[PDB]
Symmetry: C2
Subunit: 292 residues, 2 copies
């Protein structure tokens, strides 16, 4: 294999992490676990894998039994025909956590995995002790306001939200070429490119390089409409909510969370654009320790 196995990757981590599999509801999920304490669930997003949490999992494993998943269609997990709406994927994680003997877990999600961490606290509040959302708010009616074009100074367009809606074309252009996508996303994100080295980038690209791997990733975005339907319907969250926002998304994230939760805390990752676990593992790790 072009990159090491998740098995080898897990063991490279300080300390005592182990790569594993579990079948739930017909879908085999991959995850990496270790550390001792109350359970803490880490959910990554696109186009990443559990390996996105490599920088913080050690410090977090000191206080919690860390469980870093690959969502369905992500990396080492099964890549089924459907079920990529955020609700269904939170259900998978529900079954997974209970199947491992926990009635309640701390949750933390990033990007797509943040939408999933929100749909987890929304649909299974009993099984959610505290919830942390890194950067990315759950889809709502405001996704329809995203513009194709930004006036030159204004910001950055999330072009992949449009591109990932397409059938066939994404896998046709991106299969075997995800390293370039990953390189583009980091060139418009990181203050320092060496924050995510060549090998780590290749680990992500290998997870996504096959045509079925690219297609599954897109399913996450194609379920945007559904996710938006489902969001209107959710009651407010009662359990403690943590929102960590970068410079790009902090106040949008604060606006939405305070409108969707009664007990909210906000932290600003002042040196990060999007990839908080990789960009500021220091701040993220500490924030989640304090919060939990």
């Amino acid at each position: 294999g072009p990159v090491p196995s998740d098995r080898e990757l897990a063991r490279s981590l300080p300390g005592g992490f182990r790569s594993r599999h579990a079948r739930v509801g017909g879908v085999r999920l991959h995850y990496v676990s270790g550390g001792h304490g109350e359970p803490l669930l880490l959910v990554p997003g696109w186009p990443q894998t559990w390996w996105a949490y490599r920088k913080v999992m050690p410090q977090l494993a000191r206080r919690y039994h860390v469980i870093a998943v690959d969502l369905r269609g992500m990396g080492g997990s099964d890549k089924p025909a459907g079920g990529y709406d955020k609700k269904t994927m939170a259900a998978d994680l529900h079954a997974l956590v209970r199947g491992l003997g926990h009635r309640q877990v701390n949750v933390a999600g990033h990007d797509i995995g943040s939408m999933v961490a929100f749909a987890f606290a929304a649909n299974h509040p009993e099984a959610t002790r505290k919830v942390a959302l890194l950067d990315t708010p759950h889809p709502d009616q405001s996704e329809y306001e995203m513009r194709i074009l930004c006036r030159p100074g204004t910001g950055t367009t999330l072009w992949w939200w449009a591109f990932n809606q397409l059938q066939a074309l994404p896998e046709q252009l991106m299969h075997g070429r995800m390293r370039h996508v990953i390189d583009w996303l980091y060139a418009n994100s990181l203050a320092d490119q060496s924050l995510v080295g060549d090998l780590d980038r290749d680990i992500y690209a290998n997870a996504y390089n096959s045509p079925q791997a690219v297609r599954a990733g897109t399913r996450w975005y194609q379920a945007c409409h559904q996710d938006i339907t489902d969001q209107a319907g959710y009651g407010k969250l009662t359990m403690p909510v943590l929102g960590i926002g970068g410079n790009f998304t902090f106040e949008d994230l604060r606006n939405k969370l305070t409108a969707q939760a009664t007990d909210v805390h906000m932290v600003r990752a002042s040196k990060s654009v999007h990839y908080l676990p990789e960009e500021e593992p220091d701040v993220v790790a500490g924030a989640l320790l304090d919060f939990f």
Copy 2:
């Protein structure tokens, strides 16, 4: 594998088209010309070439001297580092046409070539007899209202307006794979996929498949900010204007042209989505003969 050359392609048409070149402002343009009559300039868009006009050139050639170009950055034309705003590309065509001894020309364009057509009239009204615009209006403030996401029942998103803004990534993903891009666009426009055959699709892919060819293509889209600015300085067009719109862009095309010009005629291509000269050749060709008269 390889496709026919532009000289071969031009000679395959009825009747009398020759494949040519002219150096203007140091930039070398490829074009195909033929026929007899008043000069008719024909400008294509992304990701096509002059060959997009194959179905309508023979009819038009019976009445006009047809000059069907490849824009700066397109097909057989040079691909310099800059100059991809519509005003500069219009100047190119203005230098070309005048250098061929034509003080005034009829002009029709499509897609990106429609923006160029419009820019040509806006910057050189003395050199523009009349102008026709197929489907695509010139960039203005409304481009900043286009949405990344449409609701399920709603019209189609122009995802490539966003994608082609990018540096480096588009070459990296599309080089060698342009046939797929072209198939997606036709899958989402043609009523019947045989309206544009395999060989014609490969003719476009080949022109666009190199990293530099893709990069050039995106330059047309990246110049949108500049084009929008330039448009805010343009006075209304007073020469005769013809807008030919697809079935789902007609209303938008009309409202924008009647706001930007004073003498407008509209034709609806009501079996077409976007590639008008390929989807309704006889409607296009007819609308142009009647309007250039």
